[PDB]
Amino acid sequence: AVGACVLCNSQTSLRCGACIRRPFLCCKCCYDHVISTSHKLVLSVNPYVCNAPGCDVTDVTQLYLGGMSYYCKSHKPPISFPLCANGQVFGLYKVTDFNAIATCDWTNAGDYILANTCTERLKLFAAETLKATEETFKLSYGIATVREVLSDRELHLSWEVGKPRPPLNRNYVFTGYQIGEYTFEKDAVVYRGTTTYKLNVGDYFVLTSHTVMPLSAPTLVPQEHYVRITGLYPTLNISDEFSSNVANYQKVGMQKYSTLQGPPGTGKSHFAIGLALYYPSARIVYTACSHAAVDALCEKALKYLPIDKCSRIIPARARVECFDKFKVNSTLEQYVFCTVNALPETTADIVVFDEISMATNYDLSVVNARLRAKHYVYIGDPAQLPAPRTLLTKGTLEPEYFNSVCRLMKTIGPDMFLGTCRRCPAEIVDTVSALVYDNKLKAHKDKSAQCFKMFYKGVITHDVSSAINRPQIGVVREFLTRNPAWRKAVFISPYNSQNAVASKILGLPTQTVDSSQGSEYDYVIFTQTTETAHSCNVNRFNVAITRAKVGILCIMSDRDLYDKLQFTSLEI
Ligand SMILES: [Zn+2]
Ligand SMILES: [Zn+2]
Ligand SMILES: [Zn+2]
């Protein structure tokens, strides 16, 4: 029971027993915590509890030291000292922000604001606390027992009475019973098992509650600026393709860590892989939270880097299908592509952490704990989507609060900014440039004259909470008959239920705005579905319309975002 105080590092035997992460708090900070919060249980080798037989006094403010033991006011000997007095709690070696992190339920946006504006040790305490609170919350839901199986992809479920039913989307991942992880989509439901197994009737599914490990490494290592490129050896023969990023690559070797804000289609993966060609002998670990982000880096590496020096790290508990072209699980290869949770304990000359808007402070800390590098490059865009905060229900989380990296990019600016969008028609570039980039994003492409908008509120029905707009899908159906080139469009909306309906009525491939992030398609058809904070979110709107290379049709519910679209308006 010997450790360091999370607020002032002073050594102690005192841990707060009421905090779910039981942080070590010194004599001074333990007092400031117990006297200002409902937290009154203090722990050491032995807890601070009344030693008198059958006594239930556990409140440190109602306890005293009687020689070497602890007793309440009713049981203490005449010669006894209060454990709580004079701004200290008794212990060996003898905060407003800590109290709020320690006691919040993580349902308000203000809780996440604090977890990102506090000191570095409090950011780790906040990240550990939040993740443990998120995992304990998973236990609240009800079990689903297979009543009947229809085909190889569809079944019917029987839910536990009394306990709430979690939202059925590709976001919530169940664990089958250990018949592999399973996922659900909208009385006939669609079942998706990782391991192809003949769905046994009577078997049950439960959400994967994993143990939250403690955080040691900071979210960001301390910044170091150098006079020369350090520990990296540049090429003088650098491919003309990557010449645009030479000054940025030099900035990377002249700092401990660097931030790159890359709006959609501005060249983030090109930048990440070109960094390997610019420092040809440097061992680079490419990491991101999702398998899709890691795979998109693998695809770019396949095109420019020697395949024999690449390796895709895959966890033995193979969840989803990923990149199969590199040698699997070779930690020692020069180029290692791996998701944040599967990272081995290794070193590198450069660590590239991509899709930084999707990282949490927990992820930022894990990377710093498993990878010791000469340089760290954080690539992403705070104008794109963050990681879903399952507990957050009240208030909106602004980009400067996504994580420490996004906070830096939004306050002091990013170290490097990719200012030219090469993917999108100018109509889209001009719209998002004004909306989220302060007019700094420029279009490479001309206006395509294939970007349309329609203001159509339709009718909003709901599949539990997930929304559907059948009249908006009807407008799309009518448009498709008159615009056959759009037969190849990807249908996008903010809701899985809208997408399930569009899939059956239109037959187009479907994507939620959130799962479309990082991907691009020639034609995109977007139905806003509703006017909610979710469907009107500017970052979500930004991602939605920037998926299109050639054309986009936006069927809008919100007048504000409709008016902001620099698209040709359609009638009906
Ligand atoms: Zn302290
Ligand atoms: Zn506490
Ligand atoms: Zn007592």
PDB file of C-alpha atoms and ligand atoms in Angstrom, residues 16 18-19 33 39 102, ligand 2:
ATOM      1  CA  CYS A  16      -9.510   7.015  -1.322  1.00  0.00           C
ATOM      2  CA  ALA A  18     -14.769   5.692  -2.190  1.00  0.00           C
ATOM      3  CA  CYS A  19     -13.068   6.494  -5.586  1.00  0.00           C
ATOM      4  CA  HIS A  33     -11.133  15.486  -0.831  1.00  0.00           C
ATOM      5  CA  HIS A  39     -16.118  10.304  -0.131  1.00  0.00           C
ATOM      6  CA  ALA A 102     -13.817  11.549  -8.670  1.00  0.00           C
TER       7      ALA A 102
HETATM    8 ZN    ZN B   2     -12.672   9.761  -3.491  1.00  0.00          ZN
END
